[PDB]
Design a protein around this nucleic acid. Structure first.
Ligand SMILES: [Mg+2]
Ligand SMILES: [Mg+2]
Ligand SMILES: [Mg+2]
Ligand SMILES: [Mg+2]
Ligand SMILES: [Mg+2]
Ligand SMILES: [Mg+2]
Ligand SMILES: [Mg+2]
Ligand SMILES: [Mg+2]
Ligand SMILES: [Mg+2]
Ligand SMILES: [Mg+2]
Ligand SMILES: [Mg+2]
Ligand SMILES: [Mg+2]
Ligand SMILES: [Mg+2]
Ligand SMILES: [Mg+2]
Ligand SMILES: [Mg+2]
Ligand SMILES: [Mg+2]
Ligand SMILES: [Mg+2]
Ligand SMILES: [Mg+2]
Ligand SMILES: [Mg+2]
Ligand SMILES: [Mg+2]
Ligand SMILES: [Mg+2]
Ligand SMILES: [Mg+2]
Ligand SMILES: [Mg+2]
Ligand SMILES: [Mg+2]
Ligand SMILES: [Mg+2]
Ligand SMILES: [Mg+2]
Ligand SMILES: [Mg+2]
Ligand SMILES: [Mg+2]
Ligand SMILES: [Mg+2]
Ligand SMILES: [Mg+2]
Ligand SMILES: [Mg+2]
Ligand SMILES: [Mg+2]
Ligand SMILES: [Mg+2]
Ligand SMILES: [Mg+2]
Ligand SMILES: [Mg+2]
Ligand SMILES: [Mg+2]
Ligand SMILES: [Mg+2]
Ligand SMILES: [Mg+2]
Ligand SMILES: [Mg+2]
Ligand SMILES: [Mg+2]
Ligand SMILES: [Mg+2]
Ligand SMILES: [Mg+2]
Ligand SMILES: [Mg+2]
Ligand SMILES: [Mg+2]
Ligand SMILES: [Mg+2]
Ligand SMILES: [Mg+2]
Ligand SMILES: [Mg+2]
Ligand SMILES: [Mg+2]
Ligand SMILES: [Mg+2]
Ligand SMILES: [Mg+2]
Ligand SMILES: [Mg+2]
Ligand SMILES: [Mg+2]
Ligand SMILES: [Mg+2]
Lengths: 49, 172, 106, 197, 127
RNA sequence: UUUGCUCCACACAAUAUAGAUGGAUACGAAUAAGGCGUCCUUGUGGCGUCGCUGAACCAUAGCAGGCUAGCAACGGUGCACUUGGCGGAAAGGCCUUGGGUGCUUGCUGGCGAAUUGCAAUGUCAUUUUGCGUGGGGAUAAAUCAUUUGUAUACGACUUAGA
RNA sequence: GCCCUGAAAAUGGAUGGCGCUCAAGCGUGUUACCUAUACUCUACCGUCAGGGUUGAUAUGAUGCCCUGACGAGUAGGCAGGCGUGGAGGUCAGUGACGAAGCCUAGACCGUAAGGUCGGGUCGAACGGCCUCUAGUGCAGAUCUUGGUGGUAGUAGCAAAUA
RNA sequence: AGAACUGGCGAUGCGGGAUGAACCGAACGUAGAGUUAAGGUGCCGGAAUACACGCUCAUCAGACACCACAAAAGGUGUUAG
RNA sequence: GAAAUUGUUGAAAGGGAAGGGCAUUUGAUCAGACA
């Protein structure tokens, strides 16, 4: 019929599905752009909270 | 409406006691066969005379053949036609090799440019324009300049099979 | 030599049909290199064999054949209609077929 | 005619390439199409872009996952035009489609296997000269396709190797022609002339 | 050994099963005519089962002929069997289902003697 | 768990087959322009030539292709080796060396073919698997139960345990 | 004339779809081609009609033979038939050496209602033909009575302190 | 909503109009061969990516009766008068 | 000692129902007719 009062949807559709991850180790979806001028190094690091 | 022939059709009102020998009127008619041609005849007579076919007779019907079928000719053509919202006179020039060929392209043209079907047209006159320079429409004049020549760029060969092994060339 | 072919390659295409109704009794055949009905007139009457394989041996063979004849031409592009001893199976639309050279008239 | 026919997509018109490919399949002719990124659609780029976003809005309202799928790749655009011309929910149709393979660029096997064209769908032979048209590769990249650059790069690499292959071959048939030459004007040669060879 | 006859043509070998007799157990396959007002079958829409009707009727020549060319005639005993003594090219004896084992060997024997064909000699056969 | 697994080899058995039956025969680019040849001053160059379809090119003769002899050539090609190199877009295939061996219808010979009876696909392809044989090769793990709590309704997850 | 503006609605979406641009678009012309239970010819069923044929010594005169045309169908009418319980007659019918019934993607006759046979099970009675007779044929009636499913190993078996 | 004449649907499948009671075509015994109707012949899909002359380029082109809509009014787009 | 419905065994098919029509392949099965 049409809401009545407008209000923003609850929660973000960009974080779906809200299932359990496929593993404890979250994946690195993306690394920094490469600049081959600089010395070789890692671009990330493992640790424990 | 088809591939035209041209007919002389001659008719008259039926004779009577007090009037034997009625007058005799002829029309040149462009139609694809003599049945359509005798019909067209009565159509037009009934727009000119007190007659109908029920009280008249066709006296003669005779196909007229082009006099010089392989001489190229510039035709003046006069037409009356009906549009969706009114009726109208027109002059077109056609260049072909026989009145018959000329009339076939006219009806084509009238159909394509003006959406006039065959029912809606009246050839008023078709006549060979004798001297050039009484040729009036440019799309024809174009073709009577001295020593005329022209290429046909972008040649398109028809394939005979679905696959080719070359890559065509439109040269010519 | 290397070739032994005594038939013309061909293809089972459709049954004779409407938009919405087919008729298994007549099969439609495309013949290699026949482009027109005039070309196809040559093959009218020639005999067709659909040759297939099977697991059970029969009269000492694992190869079987459905036999037929070309009967008339079809449309404008040298396709041909044919009838068979038994109507062709229809899993074979798009299967190969053999058009012999007999009965011969040359 | 041949067991597998490789079509060089470049310079062809999508729906006319599609219409003939579907047919060949249905009649049992295996087909592989290459360089689908160099495919054409008539009508200028903007129109076909607009047309594609029309496509993009269609989706299953309760679940966009079950709704129409929008493949961005120039080969998959192409497959769509094809699949649309094949009774593809029948077993016969599935069968037909397995006879088909469509690619961007010319990847192995096919880079050394000859490719043919289909004149009745050749853009340069069909479109009135002057009319605007659209390259599939460019249409795709603008709706999401990710790999124009890496096709372009691979192709350019591939094109180097094939100009060598070619150069060699053209050099080998200059000799071969310098053969058919001594042999010319000889008895066996004019005898073969006589019979049209 | 049967009168020569023209090739027997059967026109509709397939059984005319009742509509939906495949769909509910309660409906036997025995032919029964749709009388419903809306029924696709009775209205004969493209796609549904045929109904029996008189065009299917068999050549008056080959009708009642079973494959061998003989009409079959049910037989309960020698006397019945002897009604076919002048008709062995034309009728064939079938021994009735409730005829006893020993009584079939008598019938089977006489039929051999008279040259009368028997459609089911192997019945109750003491093998 | 009664001698299992794997790659190569051949043998038998079975099971298939969306449909072998001479050959999928490799520039690129343009189309109001190009391909090829040739020269040169190497260029948006001169000169020649070609198209108008693959109606081509290549292959193709021999018991479905038998058994044999010779000559002219030194060429062609099958096979298995071996030399050097290339190809990662799905390379898994291409090119090159060298000896061996077969075939050669380039040409000339000797023998064979019938009775499959006037046609009957007249059977010559390539899928997957199963059982033994012997020539190489290789000698794990997962799950239940127990256990953690970075996890959990139950499954699941995540730990730990010679 | 075609095209453009004028031209705003609710799930994503329809020249039937793909797609199409010297069209696979619009107007018009010319051929060819595809295909209805319709038209033409033929066979076979049945309906109606018009003929022919009692002459013994063989078998249907409601018969047999020749010929022509016709065939949609609710409500409804009539006709010829199929099937059940019981009755008169008949076949000196079937049967404990297995009646009846029941089972059987086995066989055969009939356009069909149905009829016949084989095999298995079974255990005491039963059937063809001419007639007589009716409490004579079921898918439905929120039909009657009995039996049985899916639902489902599901809801649940949690008040009264242990 | 209501009348007139006819033809239909209801009571009727079959081919066409994708689809659909009534539109087009054509009315039905079981079948073989042939030829057609209305309607089609790029591909789905049987059937010319046939021939021929024009016209049309749309940043919401257009695409076949019943039929699934568009008007006044405008354009120095282009066409022929 | 039917049927609904059920267990086992054997055979077969199964990408959002199943069943049906005309037709043929394949498999399984079976009648007849021959001399
Ligand atoms: Mg609001
Ligand atoms: Mg998971
Ligand atoms: Mg004149
Ligand atoms: Mg009923
Ligand atoms: Mg109803
Ligand atoms: Mg009704
Ligand atoms: Mg298969
Ligand atoms: Mg040149
Ligand atoms: Mg050069
Ligand atoms: Mg130059
Ligand atoms: Mg060549
Ligand atoms: Mg040899
Ligand atoms: Mg691949
Ligand atoms: Mg020799
Ligand atoms: Mg071993
Ligand atoms: Mg529209
Ligand atoms: Mg269309
Ligand atoms: Mg047109
Ligand atoms: Mg008929
Ligand atoms: Mg008739
Ligand atoms: Mg009737
Ligand atoms: Mg009765
Ligand atoms: Mg009774
Ligand atoms: Mg009673
Ligand atoms: Mg049963
Ligand atoms: Mg029997
Ligand atoms: Mg028994
Ligand atoms: Mg019994
Ligand atoms: Mg007792
Ligand atoms: Mg009675
Ligand atoms: Mg009662
Ligand atoms: Mg009932
Ligand atoms: Mg009941
Ligand atoms: Mg009920
Ligand atoms: Mg009822
Ligand atoms: Mg009940
Ligand atoms: Mg109950
Ligand atoms: Mg329990
Ligand atoms: Mg519970
Ligand atoms: Mg409770
Ligand atoms: Mg009417
Ligand atoms: Mg009513
Ligand atoms: Mg009707
Ligand atoms: Mg229909
Ligand atoms: Mg419509
Ligand atoms: Mg479709
Ligand atoms: Mg077609
Ligand atoms: Mg033609
Ligand atoms: Mg109108
Ligand atoms: Mg204007
Ligand atoms: Mg008991
Ligand atoms: Mg089974
Ligand atoms: Mg069947």
């Amino acid at each position: 019929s049409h809401r009545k009062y407008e209000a923003p949807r609850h929660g973000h559709l960009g974080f779906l599905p809200r299932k359990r991850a496929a593993s404890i180790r979250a994946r690195v979806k993306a690394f920094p752009k490469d600049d081959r001028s600089k010395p070789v190094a890692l671009t990330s690091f493992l640790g424990y909270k | 409406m088809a591939h035209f022939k041209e007919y002389q059709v001659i008719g008259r009102r039926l004779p009577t006691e007090s009037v034997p020998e009625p007058k005799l009127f002829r029309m040149r008619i462009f139609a694809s066969n003599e049945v359509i041609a005798k019909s067209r005849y009565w159509y037009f007579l009934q727009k000119l005379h007190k007659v109908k076919k029920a009280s008249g007779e066709i006296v003669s019907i005779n196909q007229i053949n082009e006099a010089h079928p392989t001489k190229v000719k510039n035709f003046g053509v006069w037409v009356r036609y009906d549009s969706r919202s009114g009726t109208h006179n027109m002059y077109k020039e056609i260049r072909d090799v026989s009145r018959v060929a000329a009339v076939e392209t006219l009806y084509q043209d009238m159909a394509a440019r003006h959406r006039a079907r065959f029912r809606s047209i009246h050839i008023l006159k078709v006549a060979e324009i004798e001297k050039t320079a009484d040729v009036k429409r440019q799309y024809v004049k174009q073709f009577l300049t001295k020593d005329l020549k022209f290429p046909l760029p972008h040649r398109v060969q028809k394939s005979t099979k679905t696959f080719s092994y070359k890559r065509p060339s439109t040269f010519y | 030599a290397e070739s032994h072919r005594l038939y013309v390659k061909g293809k089972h295409l459709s049954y004779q049909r409407s938009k919405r109704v087919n008729n298994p009794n007549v099969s439609l055949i495309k013949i290699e290199g026949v482009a027109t009905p005039q070309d196809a007139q040559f093959y009218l009457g020639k005999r067709i064999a659909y040759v297939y394989r099977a697991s059970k041996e029969v009269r000492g063979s694992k190869i079987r054949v459905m036999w037929g004849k070309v009967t008339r031409t079809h449309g404008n592009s040298g396709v041909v209609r044919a009838t068979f001893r038994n109507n062709l199976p229809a899993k074979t639309f798009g299967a190969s077929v053999r058009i012999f050279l007999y009965p011969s008239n040359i | 005619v041949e067991p597998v026919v490789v079509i060089d997509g470049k310079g062809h018109l999508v729906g006319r390439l599609a219409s003939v490919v579907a047919k060949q399949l249905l009649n049992g002719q295996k087909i592989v199409v290459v360089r689908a990124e160099e495919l054409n659609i008539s009508g200028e780029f903007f129109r076909n872009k607009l047309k594609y976003h029309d496509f993009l809005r269609k989706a299953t309202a309760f679940n966009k996952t079950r709704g129409p799928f929008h493949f961005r790749a120039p080969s998959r655009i192409f497959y769509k035009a094809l699949r649309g011309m094949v009774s593809h929910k029948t077993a016969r149709g599935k069968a037909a489609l397995e006879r088909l393979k469509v690619f961007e660029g010319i990847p192995p096997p096919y880079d050394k296997k000859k490719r043919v064209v289909v004149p009745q769908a050749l853009r340069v032979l069909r479109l009135k000269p002057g009319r605007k048209y659209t390259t599939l590769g460019k249409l795709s990249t603008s709706v999401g396709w990710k790999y124009e650059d890496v096709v372009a790069k691979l192709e350019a690499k591939r094109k180097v190797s094939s100009a060598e292959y070619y150069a060699k071959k053209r050099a080998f048939t200059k000799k071969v022609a310098s053969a058919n030459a001594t042999a010319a004007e000889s008895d066996v040669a004019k005898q073969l002339a006589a019979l049209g060879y | 050994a049967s009168l020569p006859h023209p090739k027997i043509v059967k026109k509709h070998t397939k059984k005319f099963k009742r509509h939906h007799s495949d769909r509910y157990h309660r409906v036997a396959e025995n032919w029964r005519k749709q009388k419903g007002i809306d029924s696709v079958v009775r209205r004969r829409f493209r796609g549904n089962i045929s109904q029996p009707k008189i065009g299917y009727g068999s050549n008056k020549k080959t009708k009642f002929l079973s494959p061998s060319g003989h009409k079959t005639f049910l037989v309960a005993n020698v006397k019945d069997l002897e009604t076919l003594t002048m008709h062995t090219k034309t009728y064939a004896a079938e021994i009735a289902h409730n005829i006893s084992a020993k009584n079939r060997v008598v019938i089977l024997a006489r039929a051999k003697a008279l040259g009368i064909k028997v459609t089911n000699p192997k019945g109750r056969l003491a093998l």
